[PDB]
Amino acid sequence: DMTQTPASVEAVVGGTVTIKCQASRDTGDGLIWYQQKPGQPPKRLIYKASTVASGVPSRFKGRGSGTDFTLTISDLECADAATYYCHSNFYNRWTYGNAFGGGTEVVVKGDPVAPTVLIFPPAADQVATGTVTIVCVANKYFPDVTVTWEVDGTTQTTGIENSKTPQNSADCTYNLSSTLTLTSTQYNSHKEYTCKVTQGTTSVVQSFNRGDC
């Protein structure tokens, strides 16, 4: 089988990382690396352990042979944030449970930025359905945030779903959408809706009053 380490690694813009692929059985130079960004198909980066595919920059340096391989990415860019997979293609020699390694996530560390935060009250036609969804968006931030919802000052512990975009290819930042779902009855029974987005010792808070919208 194929074992990749580390599971994740964080490194500064302009920096260098080396990630590891270990095959339990010798796979010669039959070793391919792929880059996959969240929500996209994989892209082949390196084949025959060290040959970069056409259009791939030379700062992607594959090395090794046999049972131990490395991929070194130097001069890291925000565009390099992705999960990288190795792949053995010795199908006529070995059986496989999986020909791929488990992947290494590469997180590219840019400058810290606090989010700007937006809150969207439920559209007028939502309440008629019996369920309402309030949406809070934290835009253009790094590093990760935590989200708290409060209804009339009471922290919510259920009904919350969060979704985060991948790191921005230009500046490394994230965006986050957080939704609070309530019945129409619950929604009409409270006034103040608050989303609080916390980044360490910083919080950014956005509120609305159900009467005003």
Partner: peptide, 4 residues
């Protein structure tokens, strides 16, 4: 191929 695929067997070294």
């Amino acid at each position: 191929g695929x067997a070294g």
